[PDB]
Design a protein around this motif. Structure first.
Motif, short mmCIF file in Angstrom:
data_model
loop_
_atom_site.label_atom_id
_atom_site.label_comp_id
_atom_site.label_asym_id
_atom_site.label_seq_id
_atom_site.Cartn_x
_atom_site.Cartn_y
_atom_site.Cartn_z
N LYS A 60 0.80 -1.11 -0.07
CA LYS A 60 0.04 0.07 0.06
C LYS A 60 0.65 1.40 0.10
O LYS A 60 0.28 2.39 -0.42
CB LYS A 60 -0.99 0.11 1.25
N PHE A 61 2.06 1.36 0.67
CA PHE A 61 2.71 2.59 0.59
C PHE A 61 4.25 2.05 1.05
O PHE A 61 4.39 0.93 1.22
CB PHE A 61 2.32 3.25 1.67
N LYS A 62 5.33 2.96 0.72
CA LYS A 62 6.73 2.28 1.09
C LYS A 62 7.27 3.48 2.17
O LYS A 62 6.64 4.58 2.10
CB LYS A 62 7.22 1.98 -0.09
N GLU A 63 8.35 3.17 2.69
CA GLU A 63 9.14 3.73 3.58
C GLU A 63 9.61 5.22 3.00
O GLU A 63 9.62 6.42 3.74
CB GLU A 63 10.22 3.07 4.02
N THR A 64 9.85 5.26 1.68
CA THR A 64 10.19 6.38 0.91
C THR A 64 9.01 7.17 0.65
O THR A 64 9.21 8.58 -0.01
CB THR A 64 11.23 5.91 -0.25
N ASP A 65 7.78 6.93 0.65
CA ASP A 65 6.74 7.84 0.42
C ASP A 65 6.49 8.94 1.38
O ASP A 65 6.65 8.85 2.72
CB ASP A 65 5.25 7.19 0.16
N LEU A 66 6.19 10.12 0.87
CA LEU A 66 5.92 11.23 1.61
C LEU A 66 4.30 11.53 2.14
O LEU A 66 3.48 11.04 1.29
CB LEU A 66 6.42 12.42 0.82
N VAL A 67 4.06 11.91 3.31
CA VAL A 67 3.25 12.25 4.06
C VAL A 67 2.88 13.44 4.36
O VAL A 67 3.88 14.22 5.06
CB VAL A 67 2.86 11.29 5.11
N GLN A 82 10.52 8.23 8.70
CA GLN A 82 10.70 9.09 9.69
C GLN A 82 9.31 8.92 10.83
O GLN A 82 9.48 8.99 11.97
CB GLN A 82 10.66 10.36 9.56
N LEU A 83 8.05 8.69 10.33
CA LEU A 83 6.89 8.73 10.99
C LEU A 83 6.84 7.59 11.82
O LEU A 83 6.35 7.65 12.95
CB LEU A 83 5.80 9.11 10.04
N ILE A 84 7.38 6.44 11.31
CA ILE A 84 7.26 5.06 12.09
C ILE A 84 8.26 5.24 13.02
O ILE A 84 8.14 4.54 13.91
CB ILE A 84 7.00 4.04 11.10
N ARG A 85 9.39 5.68 12.66
CA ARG A 85 10.42 5.68 13.53
C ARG A 85 10.19 6.49 14.84
O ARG A 85 10.02 5.92 15.98
CB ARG A 85 11.86 6.02 12.89
N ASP A 86 9.26 7.39 14.51
CA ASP A 86 8.82 8.38 15.71
C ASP A 86 7.56 7.53 16.39
O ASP A 86 7.69 7.92 17.62
CB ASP A 86 8.12 9.64 15.21
N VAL A 97 -1.50 9.97 14.12
CA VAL A 97 -2.59 10.46 13.51
C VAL A 97 -2.50 10.82 11.86
O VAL A 97 -3.05 10.30 10.99
CB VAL A 97 -3.12 11.86 14.17
N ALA A 98 -1.03 11.21 11.71
CA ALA A 98 -0.63 11.38 10.31
C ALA A 98 -0.65 10.19 9.60
O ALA A 98 -1.02 10.09 8.33
CB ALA A 98 0.64 12.33 10.29
N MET A 99 -0.05 9.03 10.32
CA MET A 99 -0.27 7.70 9.50
C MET A 99 -1.47 7.43 9.84
O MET A 99 -1.76 6.37 8.65
CB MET A 99 0.94 6.78 10.17
N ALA A 100 -2.24 7.36 10.41
CA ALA A 100 -3.73 6.87 10.46
C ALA A 100 -4.51 7.39 9.15
O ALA A 100 -5.09 6.66 8.45
CB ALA A 100 -4.47 7.01 11.77
N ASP A 101 -4.52 8.72 8.79
CA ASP A 101 -5.05 9.37 7.96
C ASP A 101 -4.38 8.86 6.41
O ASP A 101 -5.30 8.37 5.88
CB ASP A 101 -5.07 10.96 7.86
N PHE A 102 -3.16 8.85 6.36
CA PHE A 102 -2.56 8.40 5.05
C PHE A 102 -2.77 6.83 5.00
O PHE A 102 -3.12 6.57 3.72
CB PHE A 102 -1.04 8.46 5.28
N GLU A 168 18.51 4.90 17.74
CA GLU A 168 18.45 6.42 17.55
C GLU A 168 17.94 6.39 16.10
O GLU A 168 18.29 5.66 15.18
CB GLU A 168 19.87 7.00 17.71
N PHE A 169 17.37 7.78 15.77
CA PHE A 169 17.06 8.11 14.46
C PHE A 169 16.92 9.77 14.34
O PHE A 169 16.76 10.10 15.47
CB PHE A 169 15.77 7.44 14.21
N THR A 170 17.00 10.03 13.19
CA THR A 170 16.93 11.71 13.16
C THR A 170 15.75 12.33 12.73
O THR A 170 15.12 12.23 11.80
CB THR A 170 18.00 12.02 12.41
N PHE A 171 14.79 12.88 13.61
CA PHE A 171 13.70 13.68 13.21
C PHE A 171 14.40 14.78 12.60
O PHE A 171 15.01 15.32 13.51
CB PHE A 171 12.62 13.83 14.56
N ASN A 172 14.23 15.28 11.48
CA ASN A 172 14.64 16.66 11.10
C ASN A 172 16.00 17.26 11.38
O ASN A 172 16.16 18.56 11.62
CB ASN A 172 13.69 17.72 11.51
#
Length: 337
Positions: A60-67, A82-86, A97-102, A168-172
Motif C-alpha cells: 500500500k505504501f513504502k518507507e520512501t513515500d511522503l506524508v 521518519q513517521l514510523i520511527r517516531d 494521526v498522520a499515519m492513520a489518515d495516510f 536512535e533516529f533523526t527527526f529533522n
C-alpha cells in the motif's frame, strides 16, 4: 528424583500483572493476573504499528513515500520511515494521526482496523478507541493480550519489528532516542518492544529477548516504581532463560517415520508433521526427551493424500506426554491397483 524434575519458584515481580511466554512454542512460563483488563496507555501504539506493518507488507505504501501533515506542523512533507520511527522508538502521538489518515483515510477507519486485527489474533480482552491511547480513559488490554500482540509483530511483520531495536533516529536534523532502556543492557539480547507510563497505567513494558535460537516475550503491566521500570522485566527474562529451553525436535517436510502401505503406487509412506515442532522444557532435559508415534489403523491402505493424518506423535518426558501432534503423509500415494 527431585533435582531433575524440580519445578522452579517464580521470582517476586513488583507489578500488578505479568506474563512470560516462549515466542516459538507459545508456552506460558510464568503468569500473574495475565487476563485482567487494564489500560495499556502507549502500549496501544504496538497495535498501531502492527496495522501499519501489514499495510507496508501488502504494498500500500513504502518507507520512501511522503506524508502531508494535516489537522510537526501542518502541511510539511515527511517520509514514512521518519513517521514510523517516531511512532516505534518515541511513541509520538502526532505521527500516529498522520499515519492513520495516510493509511486508512481517517482515524476512525484506522481504529476499525486495529480492532478487527484484535479479533483476527483471537484476543479476548483488548479494545481500542484511538490510534494513540492518550485518553487515559476507556480502552483496555491485558498482559496476555499484549504479549500476543508482541509475538504477532515479530511473526507477521518482521520488517516492522526490526525497527524497534534501533537505538536512535533523526527527526529533522534532531537526534531522537529509542525510549526502551533495555536495549542498552549488556547482560541481555533485548531487541524489543514498547515502554509506556501513565500514573494510572503504572509502568508498562513488552520486551523480547533472544538466547541461542530461543526467544522469550514478557509483558509487565502496572509496574509500581520507577526503579523497577526495566529491572522487573529483566528479572523475568533472565529467569526464563536460566530454567527453560526451547528445542525443535521436528521440522516440516522431514521424514520422521516410514510405514508400509498396501495397494498404492508405492509400498512405503513417508510420515511427518505439517507444522513445525517447537517445545519448551526445563533447561538441560533434552537428552531425556523421547518421541514415539501411534497409527490409527493397523495397515495403511492406499490412496493417501498429501498431509492426510494417519496417527499421532507423542513427545515424552519422565513417562509424561508433554505434547502430541498429528502424524501426516508427506507425499501422496495414489491407489496403484
Amino acid at each position: 528424583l527431585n533435582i531433575k524434575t524440580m519445578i522452579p519458584g517464580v521470582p517476586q515481580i513488583d507489578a500488578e500483572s505479568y506474563i512470560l511466554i516462549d515466542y516459538n512454542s507459545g508456552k506460558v512460563l510464568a503468569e500473574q493476573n495475565a487476563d485482567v483488563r487494564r489500560d495499556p496507555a502507549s502500549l496501544t501504539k504496538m497495535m498501531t504499528s502492527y496495522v501499519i506493518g501489514q499495510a507496508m507488507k501488502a504494498g500500500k505504501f513504502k518507507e520512501t513515500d511522503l506524508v502531508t501533515i494535516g489537522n510537526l506542523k501542518p502541511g510539511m512533507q515527511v517520509p514514512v520511515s521518519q513517521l514510523i520511527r517516531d511512532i516505534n522508538l518515541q511513541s509520538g502521538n502526532d505521527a500516529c494521526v498522520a499515519m492513520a489518515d495516510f493509511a486508512a483515510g481517517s482515524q476512525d477507519a484506522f481504529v476499525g482496523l486495529m480492532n478487527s486485527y484484535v479479533n483476527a489474533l483471537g484476543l479476548k480482552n483488548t479494545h481500542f478507541q484511538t490510534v494513540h491511547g492518550l485518553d487515559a480513559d476507556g480502552q483496555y488490554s491485558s498482559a496476555r493480550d499484549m504479549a500476543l500482540i508482541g509475538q504477532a509483530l515479530i511473526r507477521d511483520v518482521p520488517n516492522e519489528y526490526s525497527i524497534y531495536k534501533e537505538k536512535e533516529f533523526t527527526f529533522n536534523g534532531i537526534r531522537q532516542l529509542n525510549r526502551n532502556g533495555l536495549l542498552w543492557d549488556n547482560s541481555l539480547n533485548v531487541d524489543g518492544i514498547k515502554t509506556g507510563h501513565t500514573d494510572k497505567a503504572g509502568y508498562n513494558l513488552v520486551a523480547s529477548a533472544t538466547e541461542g535460537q530461543m526467544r522469550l516475550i514478557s509483558a509487565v503491566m502496572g509496574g509500581r516504581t520507577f526503579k523497577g521500570r526495566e529491572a522487573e522485566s529483566k528479572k523475568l527474562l533472565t529467569w526464563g532463560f536460566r530454567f527453560f529451553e526451547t528445542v525443535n525436535p521436528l521440522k516440516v517436510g522431514k521424514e520422521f517415520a516410514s510405514e508400509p502401505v498396501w495397494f498404492g503406487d508405492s509400498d512405503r509412506a513417508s510420515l511427518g508433521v505439517d507444522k513445525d515442532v517447537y517445545l519448551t522444557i526445563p533447561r538441560g532435559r533434552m537428552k531425556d526427551l523421547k518421541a514415539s508415534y501411534v497409527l490409527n489403523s493397523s495397515e495403511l491402505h492406499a490412496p493417501l493424500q498429501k498431509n492426510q493424518v494417519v496417527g499421532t506423535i507423542n513427545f515424552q518426558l519422565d513417562g509424561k506426554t508433554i505434547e502430541q501432534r498429528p502424524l501426516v503423509v508427506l507425499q501422496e500415494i495414489p491407489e496403484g491397483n
